[PDB]
DNA sequence: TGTAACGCACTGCCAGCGGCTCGAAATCTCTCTCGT
DNA sequence: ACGAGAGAGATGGGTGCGTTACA
């Protein structure tokens, strides 16, 4: 278990210490393409895990980034790993804290943040509401029939207002 | 053999009693998606078999519907059975009668109905007409040089008229 | 005119490198448990 | 509401004939 302040710290320590192994090449992860999500982004007092979203530019990389992820100077086991979700246990200041990692591509970014910020109940209200208008929403995008609806948006705020919903900051989503 | 009357009785009996097994689930076939075809849709006095065209929504389901087909409370053996055609022998009022089932995916429905309605001598006239115009028509769609000619059509009638042919009632095709 | 189910011969190509079996080795689905 | 990872369960060589059978 953690506190908000500690989690923010850990998030700061990792922005600049991220890289994955690709054809024997250790490629850096720009902090520009790392977004914190989960109970942390919803400025909660007490945490459980830390969740970060990693943005991947090129489709072909997905198989390489999460399974072969590297962190400078930190001890970390691994519980499960896929291309899209990863669960690590790290040691920080001599203690064990769960860390969760996720992955989205450029045009998935707004949908991805909005999905992973949450919280659940808020997602559930939203997705149900658009289900009654024949849409499906997920972390990938908006879909009407099979075909994914292309939306002229770029930011999460932009996306929410496009989905015709009051925009609230993350710590007021229920 | 069967009287047309006995045939209508059977189809009607069957409409609300068709289901298949799919992952240990017994899935009800909607009478909405059960078309009667062959000699019975052509309203012949004397029938030899009973022909049922079943409409399957999701292509993935073809390998489950027909091979795991069940009929609530009616004896039947199975002569042959595959994904697309399946041949039964049922006990009805202490007599053995042959029942055929065929399948069609939603977007084939017009061609299928048209196909299975028959009769053969009619289809030949028709297919041979579209052949000399470099087409092939079959239960699955219309083709030109191995390429599916898409048509915005949704009924057997629309299809026939789109094909440029005088619509005849099923009982008047020869 | 146009297609399906099925049993089969002839291979082709892996588990088996000789067999055309049973059931290996690798790949699928589904089911479960998990996330937000 | 809508997806993921990881086991479990299940498949079991491709062709292409020829024959019977469907409208």
Residue numbers in the entry:
A (entry chain B), B (entry chain A): 1 to 174
What does the published report state?
Crystals of one DNAzyme/native DNA complex and DNAzyme-(2′-OMe-G) were grown in the absence of PbCl2, whereas the crystals were grown in the presence of PbCl2 for another DNAzyme/native DNA complex structure, which captured one Pb2+ ion and is referred to as DNAzyme-Pb2+ hereafter. The DNAzyme/native DNA complex without Pb2+ adopts the same space group as DNAzyme-Pb2+; as indicated by the very low value (0.307 Å) of the root mean square deviations (rmsd), the overall conformations of these two complexes are virtually identical. The conformations of the DNAzyme-Pb2+ and DNAzyme/native DNA complex without Pb2+ are virtually identical; in both structures, the N1 atom of G13 forms one hydrogen bond (H-bond, 2.8 Å) with the OP1 atom of G+1. These structural similarities indicate that the Pb2+-binding site is pre-organized and that the Pb2+ binding does not induce local and global conformational changes of this DNA catalyst. Compared to the real substrate, the G−1 residue of the native DNA lacks one hydroxyl group (O2′) at the 2′ position.
Besides 10–23 DNAzyme, 8–17 DNAzyme can also efficiently catalyze the cleavage reaction of RNA substrate, forming the 5′-product with a 2′,3′-cyclic phosphate at the 3′-end and the 3′-product with a hydroxyl group at the 5′-end; similar structural features are also observed on the cleavage products of the naturally occurred hammerhead, hairpin, and hepatitis delta virus (HDV) ribozymes. Interestingly, the same catalytic motif of 8–17 DNAzyme has been independently isolated under different selection conditions and using different cation cofactors, indicating that this small DNAzyme is efficient and its catalytic core motif is ubiquitous in the sequence space. The central catalytic core of 8–17 DNAzyme is flankedbytwo substrate-recognizing arms, which bind to the RNA substrate via the canonical Watson–Crick base pairing. The Dz36/substrate complexes assemble into a “V” shape with two arms (P1 and P2) orientated ~70° with respect to each other in all the three structures. Unexpectedly, the catalytic core forms a compact small DNA pseudoknot consisting of two short duplexes (P3 and P4) perpendicular to each other.
